């Protein structure tokens, strides 16, 4: 019927034809993996923020039902006792009890895993759509960066740590907690990989703003390009010193900057997964120890990190059951 | 102007120079060069500075046992506060360096330089005959620079609170600022993070889409996202690229300007309570515990 | 012979790109390598 060389029609041909129809929404074969997984990830996060509690996992009341708003609501990670258990509804813990499974924090595992597979499905959707209209799948390759970030920080990082407890919970305030946790413990700002990632992200934002402004300002009055490449090139050559003489390479650079930044960030977070962190400069540490008068912004950063750690571990790590007396909590006036 | 048959005026406005000077460049080049030279000199070698008048000489010079990451130009001494501290007011050059005067020199010259840089951007927008709003877009990083270098000292009443001209100094300033003002929870910095993340997002999407389209676009993006793309025309897409990061950074700079005047981020401490009144912890108060640690460790006293 | 051989082309812009990348990585990572 239809095929390469007079191939008889099979069920697969009909399924492929239906899944690739130019309807309102392109489903595609990757749709079967994206839509269920992405839909269930979003639904799990919304349900967790609305109803499910974090009282029995993190000792927190983080949901709209308990009294938290959008900022403070989150799907808290499982307790450290669960370690790296995927926390299935049918697992050895919460053996089919949906209520307890929600109480165990398994809803975070549900959201995280279904979102990982939804991201895989969305990358496959990018590939499928690119092949559909015969374009290079550079958008899928670009999306490889956010997928790398997600796999590094939500999956690889907790896997390298003591459990899912230290993954970033799906929430605004919880993500801020995760960020400050990295600051206090890993000195993640000082990590060169994070430095490269932030440089890439800020450079990508700069490229976005500058390219938009220049394309909108070098527009032509009243199949052909709508803005003057020569004018933008001259403007940036005589303002900054360097300018893009090729539109292809310019747009590829806009693609490459954020992707590289996020990939280096992912590598750095992989390193942090094992506590392999560029926390300290040993030379400066010994210089400060031997010379009390010596002080820099790096030593002050180390002191602030110590303060964060000691003042936050009491509530951020209930499983450790840390009770720091007031006399041992680090303080600025105690230096 | 009008020097030797207006030859100086012709040369300043001349577009044949490899780098267009312009009348705004007449102020940018000296200001920016002075700031660059003083910053390089201070970073390479400068005596330790009492960032606060407690007489604790914080050191940020490379020669004083620092590296590029740790090295910084220390903010001006808290004793000086907002007072104008050029070289001629200090009793001696050593006293000027010991109180962090190079920081004010660099900050003032650099702020004037970036303002005149927006000016040069307008000048060469007009000279080349195009629409002059690259300066408007550049006003965002300039706005943030002013907020971190000028507006925050103004609100806090001391140049010691301005961002140190360093990397580790920048991280310390950010940690302190989160400690004192809860930057993460403020809606304007949240909007700025959204702006930067979306700027990277749209930069990546635009690069990928244009690279794939340049076989020698609209359908691909339409089928990809279910709501399709409103910016079907490239002009609207590029304006969106300009606007999103620009206004995001405008709003984060404004947020920092507001915190300069002691208008901190959202404070949801003890927002949710038990029936008996016992405080139930959330992520907000864990952030608060972190902020408490940063605050207590900051106050070296 | 070599029916399929192509000399590598590296224009001036790519040269400066590579040199800038190497020097930037060097300045960034020297502070950590020395430690």
């Amino acid at each position: 019927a239809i095929g390469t060389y007079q191939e008889k029609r099979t069920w697969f041909d009909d399924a492929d034809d239906w899944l690739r129809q130019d309807r309102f929404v392109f489903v595609g074969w990757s749709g079967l993996l994206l839509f269920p997984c992405a839909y269930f990830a979003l639904g799990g996060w919304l349900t967790g923020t609305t109803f499910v509690t974090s009282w029995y996992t993190h000792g927190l009341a983080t949901s709209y039902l308990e009294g938290c708003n959008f900022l403070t609501a989150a799907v808290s990670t499982p307790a450290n006792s669960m370690a790296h258990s995927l926390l299935f509804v049918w697992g050895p813990e919460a053996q089919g009890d949906f209520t307890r499974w929600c109480q165990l924090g398994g809803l975070w595992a549900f959201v995280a895993l279904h979102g990982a597979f939804g991201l895989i499905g969305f990358m496959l959707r990018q590939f499928e759509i690119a092949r559909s209209v015969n374009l290079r799948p550079y958008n899928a390759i670009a999306f490889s960066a956010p997928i790398a970030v997600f796999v590094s920080v939500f999956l690889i990082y907790p896997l390298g740590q003591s459990g899912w407890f230290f993954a970033p919970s799906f929430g605004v305030a919880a993500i801020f907690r995760f960020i400050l946790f990295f600051q206090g413990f890993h000195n993640w700002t000082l990590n060169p990989f994070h430095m490269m990632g932030v440089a890439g992200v800020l450079g990508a934002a700069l490229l976005c703003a500058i390219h938009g402004a220049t394309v909108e300002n070098t527009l032509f009055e009243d199949a052909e390009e709508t803005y003057s490449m020569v004018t933008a090139n001259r403007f940036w050559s005589q303002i900054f010193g360097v300018a893009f003489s090729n539109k292809r390479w310019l747009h590829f650079f806009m693609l490459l900057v954020p992707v590289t930044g996020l990939w280096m960030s992912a590598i750095g977070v992989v390193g942090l997964a094992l506590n392999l962190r560029a926390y300290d400069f040993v030379s400066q540490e010994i210089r400060a120890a031997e010379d009390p008068e010596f002080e820099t912004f790096y030593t002050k950063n180390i002191l602030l990190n110590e303060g964060i750690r000691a003042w936050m571990a009491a509530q951020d790590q209930p499983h450790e059951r840390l009770v720091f007396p007031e006399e041992v909590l680090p303080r600025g006036n105690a230096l | 102007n009008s020097s030797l048959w207006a030859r100086f005026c012709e040369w300043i406005t001349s577009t044949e120079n490899r780098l267009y000077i312009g009348w705004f460049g007449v102020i940018m080049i000296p200001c920016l060069l002075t700031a660059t030279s003083v910053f390089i000199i201070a970073f390479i070698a400068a005596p330790p500075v009492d960032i606060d008048g407690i007489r604790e000489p914080v050191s940020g010079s490379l020669l004083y046992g620092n590296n590029i990451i740790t090295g910084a130009v220390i903010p001006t001494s808290n004793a000086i506060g907002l007072h104008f501290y050029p070289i001629w007011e200090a009793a001696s050059l050593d006293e000027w360096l010991y109180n962090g005067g190079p920081y004010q020199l660099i900050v003032c010259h650099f702020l004037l330089g970036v303002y005149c840089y927006m000016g040069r951007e307008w000048e060469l927008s007009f000279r080349l005959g195009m629409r002059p709003w690259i300066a408007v877009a550049y006003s965002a990083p300039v706005a943030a620079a002013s907020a971190v270098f000028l507006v925050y000292p103004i609100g806090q009443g001391s140049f010691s609170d301005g961002m140190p001209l360093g990397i580790s100094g920048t991280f310390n300033f950010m940690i302190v600022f989160q400690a004192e003002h809860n930057i993460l929870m403020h809606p304007f910095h949240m909007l700025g993070v959204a702006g930067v993340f979306g700027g990277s997002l749209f930069s990546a999407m635009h690069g990928s889409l244009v690279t794939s389209s340049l076989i020698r676009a609209h359908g691909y993006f339409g089928r990809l996202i279910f709501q399709y793309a409103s910016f079907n025309n490239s002009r609207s897409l590029h304006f969106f690229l300009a606007a999103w990061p620009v206004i995001g950074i405008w709003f984060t700079a404004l947020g920092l300007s507001t915190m300069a005047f002691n208008l901190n981020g959202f404070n949801f401490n003890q927002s949710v309570v038990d029936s008996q009144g016992r405080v139930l912890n959330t992520w907000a108060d864990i952030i608060n515990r972190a902020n408490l640690g940063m605050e207590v460790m900051h106050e070296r006293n | 012979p070599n029916p399929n051989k192509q000399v590598v082309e590296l224009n001036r812009t790519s040269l400066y790109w590579g040199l800038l990348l190497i020097f930037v990585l060097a300045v960034l990572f020297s502070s950590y390598i020395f430690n």
Binding site: - | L19, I44 | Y16, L20, F23, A26, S30
Partner: peptide
């Protein structure tokens, strides 16, 4: 020493900047 090598790397970066903007 350490400071001198840092300064050498920085001035080399500045020289690369100058060559790129001027020596096209």
């Amino acid at each position: 020493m350490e400071a001198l090598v840092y300064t050498f790397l920085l001035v080399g970066t500045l020289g690369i900047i100058f060559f790129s903007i001027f020596f096209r």
